[PDB]
Amino acid sequence: SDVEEIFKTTTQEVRQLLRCDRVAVYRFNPNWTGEFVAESVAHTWVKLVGPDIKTVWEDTHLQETQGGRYAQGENFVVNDIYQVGHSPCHIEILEQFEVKAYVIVPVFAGEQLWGLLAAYQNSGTRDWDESEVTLLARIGNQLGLALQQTEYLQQV
Numbered sequence: 476s477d478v479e480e481i482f483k484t485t486t487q488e489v490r491q492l493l494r495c496d497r498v499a500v501y502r503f504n505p506n507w508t509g510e511f512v513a514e515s516v517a518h519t520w521v522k523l524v525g526p527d528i529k530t531v532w533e534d535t536h537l538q539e540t541q542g543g544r545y546a547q548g549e550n551f552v553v554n555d556i557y558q559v560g561h562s563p564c565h566i567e568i569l570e571q572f573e574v575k576a577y578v579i580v581p582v583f584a585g586e587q588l589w590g591l592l593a594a595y596q597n598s599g600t601r602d603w604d605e606s607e608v609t610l611l612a613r614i615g616n617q618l619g620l621a622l623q624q625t626e627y628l629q630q631v
């Protein structure tokens with residue numbers, strides 16, 4: 476898929492921007508499961524887009540909220556998962572993939588929410604400057620605009 480090529484390049488691009496270890500792009504399914512279709516990670520960590528992904532327990536967040544906050548267009552910034560009071564159930568999943576600090580950005584493409592962008596890297600109780608958060612939400616928007624162009628010019 477030519478569109479996937481763009482995603483795979485964008486994941487790597489934004490990974491360098493926020494100095495993340497891995498960047499996963501979810502795709503909101505019509506059933507709101509939201510699977511990771513494109514992801515990139517440094518060769519020294521673990522991947523996400525793999526058929527051999529073993530998680531402590533399977534968890535979809537996207538159906539329960541059905542986009543919710545992210546569908547509303549609000550960003551979510553997590554300085555630390557133990558600090559904000561995250562669910563221990565999700566924390567165990569997060570820490571299993573070295574996720575202690577992260578920022579959630581919704582990827583609108585077209586008229587509605589297409590995917591989800593996850594940026595993080597073994598930071599712990601770090602901070603996210605708004606000037607860097609706006610850039611991440613900018614990448615998602617730019618991707619959505621591109622995605623629209625590729626949607627037509629792809630043809631069948």
Ligand SMILES: *[C@@H](C)[C@H]1/C(=C/c2[nH]c(/C=C3N=C(/C=C4/NC(=O)C(CC)=C4C)C(C)=C\3CCC(=O)O)c(CCC(=O)O)c2C)NC(=O)[C@@H]1C
Binds near residue numbers: 523563
């Ligand atoms: C414990 C897991 C119960 C639960 C809680 C819960 N989950 C979220 C948010 C997300 N969970 C995601 C799932 C995965 N799977 C992976 O392999 C992976 C890579 C590390 C992740 C992140 C997921 C993508 C999200 C969305 C990102 C987000 O944090 O919103 C939340 C949010 C609040 C919190 O406490 O973290 C909750 C409450 N969900 C279940 O299904 C379990 C019963």
